Design a protein around this nucleic acid. Structure first.
Lengths: 85, 209, 32, 103, 105
RNA sequence: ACGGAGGGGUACCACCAGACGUGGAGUCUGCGGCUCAAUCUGACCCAACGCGCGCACCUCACCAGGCCCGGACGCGCGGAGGACCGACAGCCGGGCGCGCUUUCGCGAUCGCGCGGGCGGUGGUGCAUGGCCGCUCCCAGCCCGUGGCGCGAGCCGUCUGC
RNA sequence: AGGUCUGUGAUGCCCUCAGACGCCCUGGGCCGCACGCGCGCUACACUGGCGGGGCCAGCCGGCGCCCGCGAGGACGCGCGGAGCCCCCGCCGUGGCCGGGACCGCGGGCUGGAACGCCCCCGCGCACCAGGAAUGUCUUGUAGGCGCCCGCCCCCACCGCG
C-alpha cells in the first residue's frame, strides 16, 4: 500500500500537522525514548498510575506525586507527612 | 515583590529526594534482611550521594573485598540516572538491638518460618528486650494458627503507653506478614523505652530533700 | 494461512553461471 | 574576588534548620555575612479518607508537610570563590538539609 | 520474539560492566534509554522493552541472575554462575573480571 | 444480660425556652424497581443511599466483533538439501497480507509431545493479614503478696461527700 | 462471623489458562424511565427585582496591547484580590420587570473524535410558605454572602477549607 494516493482535494483536508496533545505520562527516562506494530498501542492517551502499586484510580497528581491514596497512608511517615492538628 | 515560581524549584527539588529515600528503604527491607537492615538515611550532596545504612552486622552486607556492596552501588546508578562512583554507601552498626523493634521482629519471623512454636519465640524476644534494658514489650500473633477459625493471642510483660505525643518517640512499633501454608500469619511488635537519648517523659516529678 | 512453495535450483536461470539475475508484476525482492 | 552570592537552605524539621543557622552565622562573622531572612512557611496539605473503602462514618485524615527556608546572601564581595568552601565545611553537616549556592 | 543477536550481546556486555540491570515493569511499546547498540541500524540505537524483558526472564528462569521487585522496577543481579557464563559468550577469559570487583573509586 | 423494679448521676447525636429548617413545587445526584445486547458491581436502622475522589476513548469489570503468544525452564524427536516468520498487487472484509490467487524475501532468535510455569477488576471477607467503623461524643481495665470459700469466684476495685 | 480478595510482587483453597476470564484494537453501555425516597440547589418577592456609582477580606494569589457585544482569539512580557453592603433612581401588589424549567436558529472551546461546556436572541412549566411525620443548634455560634483547592483533555448544585 506504499504506492497508493488520493485526489489532492482529498489530501489538503488531512489533520493538523501539530502532532497530538495525548502523550503518555512518564515520571522518569526509564520508561521510554519515544504487522501488529501498526496498531498494537496506537491509542495514545494518558496512563498516569501510582508509582508504587500501579493503579489508575485515585491518583494524587498534586505536587507531582502520582501516588494512590491507599498506597499513601502507609508511606506518609517515610516521606515526611505527619498527622497533627 | 517576589516571584513564587522560582522557590518552587527548590521545594520540588526537596520533595523528589524524599521519595527517592523511601523506595530505597523498601528495596533494602526486601533484600538486606540477612544483615539485619534497620533503616536508611541520605545526605544529598552536590558532588555525589552518600548513604548511611543501619545494619546489625554490616560485615555481611559489606561483602568480601566489598564486592556485594560495590555491585549494589552500580545498580542504583542505573535507576536514578546518577553516575556510578558518585553513589558511595557508608554502613553503620547498631549496638542495643533490644532497643529496636525491627531487628527483633525479623528474628521472630526467622524463628517462626522454622516451625518453631510461637510462645517460646515470643518470650525469647521479650527476655532479650528486657535484658538489653526495657520498661516494656508487647507482641502479637494473628492468623490461622491451628484451626480454620482464626483468633489472636498477645504476650507482654511490663507497662506500655499508647496515647499522646510521647507515643511518637518512646514507643517504637513494627510489623510484618508471614506467608505460610494455611495462610497469612500477622505479627507485630512494640517496645517502650522512656530513657532513650536522655529525654524525660512528662507527668514525672522528682524531688530532693 | 498460505503455505510455502518448495525451494529448488532456481539459480539455473543461467545454463552455466552466465550471471543473469543476481515473476508476474515486476517487484523488487521485498518492497517493489 | 567579588561576585554577590546567595545561600539557600531547605528543611522539614525546625530544629536542625535552627541549628545549622547558628553554626554558619557564628562561622561567618569575619567574612561579613549577616543573619537570615526567614521566609513564609510552605504548607503542603492532603486530606484523605481514613478507610480503604466507603463504610461507616466518613472520617478524614489531615496530613501536612512544613518546609522551612532561610536565605543568607550577604557573602558577596566579602567572600571569593575559594573562600566559600571555607564556610561550607566547618559547619556541622546534617544528613538532611540541602543548601544551595548561587551568585 | 525474533530478537537479533546484537541485542543479546549488548545486554550481556552491559550486565558484565555493571553486574546489574535496574529494569522497569513496562509492557507497551518503547525504548530503553540505557543499553544501546549500533548494528545494521548503522548508529547506536536503543532496544525495545519486549525483547529485553523476554531475555531477562529467560536468564532468571535459568538461575543466571536473581530479581528483587520493590515498587515498579525490576532489580536483577548476577551470580557466580552467571559470571562463569556471560564470560563464555563474549569471548572472555577467566582472568577478566567485572568492573565492580575493583573499586568504583 | 434483662426488668412496663427502687436510689443516685449525665448529654442540644435528650428535653425545657427559642431559632433555622426538611417533608409541598422544578432541578442535581445516589438508591430500588421496569427496559435493553448489555443497562458491570459492592453496601440496607442509628453503624447503606454526592459513598467506594469528575464514566465520550482509556478508566472498565459488561455487550457485538476482530490481531498476538508476550507457552519461562529440563527429557525424546526434527530441523539449515532450510525450524520459524514478513511483503507488492486484486478481492472479501468497518479496517490489517485477518482470510483468498500467484511469488519474492529473512534465517535456528527454534518447532512438536511430555513435565512444569507466568498471568487473571474470576469466587469465597462465613478460611485469612493489614486498614477502617461500631460497642464508645463512654471511664473503665488488670498485676505481686496476703485473706475468705471444696469450687466456679470475692476482697483489693468504696450502700459516705 | 460489621466492610474490604475490585489497592498492591498481601495472601490460603477452587476455576480460567491457545477459538483464553491472558493482553491489544473498533463501536455501544454504565446517563436508558408509567413509578416510591435520601443528601442538596433554586424560589414563592417591597426586610424586594432592575440600572448606574462608591467601596473593604482570608486559605492565598500572573499581567500588558489589539480584535470581537460577549464567550473567546493573535501577539509580548513578569506582575497581581469579591459578594453582601452604602448612595442616586425606575417599578408599585398584577403568576407583573417575582421564577427561569422546557424548547428553536446561531457563534466558539476541549479534544484524534462531542454525546461535554460557555455566550446571544427568542419561548417563558410548576411555585402564593408546603399534611401526617422529622432534623440541627448556645459567641464571632446559627443563618445570609461569596472565594480558593481535590479529582479533571472541557465540566461543581459535590467534598475538604
Amino acid at each position: 500500500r506504499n504506492l497508493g494516493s488520493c485526489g489532492a482535494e482529498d489530501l489538503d483536508s488531512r489533520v493538523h500537522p501539530s502532532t497530538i496533545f495525548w502523550p503518555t505520562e512518564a515520571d522518569n527516562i526509564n520508561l521510554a525514548s519515544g504487522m501488529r506494530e501498526t496498531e498494537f498501542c496506537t491509542h495514545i492517551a494518558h496512563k498516569r498510575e501510582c508509582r508504587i502499586c500501579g493503579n489508575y484510580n485515585s491518583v494524587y497528581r498534586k505536587y507531582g506525586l502520582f501516588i494512590c491514596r491507599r498506597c499513601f497512608k502507609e508511606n506518609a511517615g517515610k516521606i515526611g507527612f505527619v498527622k497533627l492538628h | 515583590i517576589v516571584r513564587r515560581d522560582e522557590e518552587n524549584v527548590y521545594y520540588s527539588k526537596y520533595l523528589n529526594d524524599c521519595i527517592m529515600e523511601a523506595e530505597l528503604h523498601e528495596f533494602f527491607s526486601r533484600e538486606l534482611v540477612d544483615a539485619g537492615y534497620a533503616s536508611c538515611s541520605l545526605c544529598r550532596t552536590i558532588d555525589s550521594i552518600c548513604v548511611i545504612i543501619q545494619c546489625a552486622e554490616p560485615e555481611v552486607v559489606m561483602g568480601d573485598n566489598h564486592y556485594r556492596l560495590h555491585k549494589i552501588e552500580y545498580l542504583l546508578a542505573g535507576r536514578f540516572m546518577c553516575d556510578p562512583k558518585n553513589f558511595n554507601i557508608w554502613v553503620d552498626k547498631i549496638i542495643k538491638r533490644g532497643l529496636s523493634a525491627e531487628i527483633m521482629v525479623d528474628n521472630l519471623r526467622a524463628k517462626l518460618e522454622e516451625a518453631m512454636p510461637i510462645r517460646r519465640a515470643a518470650y525469647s524476644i521479650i527476655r532479650t528486650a528486657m535484658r538489653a534494658g526495657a520498661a516494656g514489650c508487647e507482641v502479637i500473633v494473628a492468623g490461622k494458627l491451628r484451626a480454620q477459625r482464626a483468633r489472636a493471642n498477645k504476650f507482654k510483660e511490663g507497662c506500655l503507653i499508647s496515647t499522646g505525643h510521647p507515643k511518637r518517640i518512646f514507643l517504637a512499633e513494627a510489623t510484618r506478614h508471614i506467608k505460610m501454608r494455611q495462610g497469612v500469619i500477622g505479627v507485630k511488635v512494640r517496645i517502650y523505652n522512656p530513657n532513650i537519648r536522655g529525654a524525660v517523659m512528662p507527668d514525672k516529678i522528682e524531688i530532693g530533700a | 494461512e498460505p503455505k510455502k512453495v518448495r525451494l529448488a535450483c532456481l539459480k539455473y536461470y543461467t545454463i552455466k553461471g552466465d550471471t543473469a539475475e543476481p515473476a508476474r508484476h515486476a517487484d523488487r525482492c521485498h518492497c517493489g | 574576588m567579588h561576585q554577590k552570592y546567595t545561600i539557600i537552605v531547605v528543611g522539614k524539621d525546625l530544629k536542625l534548620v535552627e541549628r545549622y543557622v547558628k553554626s554558619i552565622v557564628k562561622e561567618g562573622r569575619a567574612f561579613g555575612i549577616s543573619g537570615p531572612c526567614r521566609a513564609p512557611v510552605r504548607r503542603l496539605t492532603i486530606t484523605t479518607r481514613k478507610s480503604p473503602c466507603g463504610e461507616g462514618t466518613n472520617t478524614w485524615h489531615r496530613f501536612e508537610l512544613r518546609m522551612y527556608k532561610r536565605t543568607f546572601w550577604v557573602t558577596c564581595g566579602g567572600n571569593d570563590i575559594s573562600t566559600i568552601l571555607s564556610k561550607t565545611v566547618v559547619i556541622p553537616g546534617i544528613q538532611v538539609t540541602v543548601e544551595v549556592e548561587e551568585p | 520474539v525474533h530478537i537479533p543477536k546484537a541485542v543479546y550481546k549488548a545486554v550481556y556486555a552491559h550486565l558484565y560492566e555493571n553486574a546489574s540491570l535496574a529494569l522497569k515493569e513496562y509492557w507497551r511499546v518503547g525504548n530503553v534509554p540505557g543499553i544501546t547498540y549500533v548494528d545494521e541500524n548503522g548508529k547506536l540505537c536503543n532496544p525495545t522493552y519486549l525483547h529485553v524483558n523476554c531475555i531477562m526472564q529467560s536468564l532468571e528462569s535459568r538461575g543466571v541472575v536473581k530479581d528483587t521487585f520493590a515498587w515498579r522496577h525490576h532489580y536483577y543481579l548476577l551470580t557466580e554462575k552467571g559470571e562463569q557464563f556471560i564470560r563464555k559468550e563474549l569471548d572472555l577469559t577467566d582472568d577478566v573480571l567485572p568492573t565492580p570487583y575493583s573499586k568504583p573509586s
